[PDB]
Scaffold this motif. Structure first.
Motif: not given
Ligand SMILES: [Ca+2]
Ligand SMILES: [Ca+2]
Lengths: 120, 120
Positions: B10-21, B23-35
């Protein structure tokens, strides 16, 4: 065959890369200066350029800047510098990849394959 | 631009989302390989940042599956830093690989390389 141009003044590195890439069936061209590398780039139609950034006649980022005005050929850069700011500038100037020394030949080869698949 | 982050931490996933948002990008997340694979197929991201250590498998399986049906660029993250790690992932079909810890600025420049090359 696949043609790779190496732009690197440093003779030991050139010889080391050439022997590694020739043994994977690639045709290798070489240049020892930034200016000669740009001449060979236009001359030889490389499928990829491996560019060392520390060249006697200028920063290799200037090679990328000039090259990118007239060529979209993949470029993997090499550097003695590990500094983040150097990596960002070279990539944003148009390099496709950046490897700081020391690096393993095996990683360079894998990264060469990515760069060559993508352009194919 | 759409970026899919496939990351169970969760921590690095949130860090990346806020860094990339940022730069104006839209971010999608998934926490398993299948999803992740399902998001990749339905959301048509412009790129995927993939962590190799997932609860439901190795991200190399993710890459092998993806590449049967999608050329979307994939940049791997991983705490794994050995050369063999990088070679396996790249050869499977990843476009780039950054070991952790990494600089955000370097990751963003590498994301831009993948963007300009897959817009060509
Ligand atoms: Ca040099
Ligand atoms: Ca993980």
């Amino acid at each position: 065959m696949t043609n790779v141009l190496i732009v690197e003044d440093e003779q030991a590195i050139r010889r080391f890369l050439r022997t590694a890439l020739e043994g994977d069936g690639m045709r290798v061209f070489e240049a020892e200066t930034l200016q000669r590398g740009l001449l060979e780039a236009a001359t030889r139609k490389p499928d990829l350029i491996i560019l060392d950034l520390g060249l006697p006649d200028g920063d290799g980022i200037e090679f990328i800047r000039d090259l990118r005005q007239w060529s979209a050929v993949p470029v993997i850069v090499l550097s003695a510098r590990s500094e983040e700011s150097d990596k960002i500038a070279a990539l944003d100037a148009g390099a496709d990849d950046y490897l700081s020394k020391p690096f393993g030949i095996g990683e360079l080869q894998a990264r060469l394959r990515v760069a060559l698949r993508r352009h194919s």
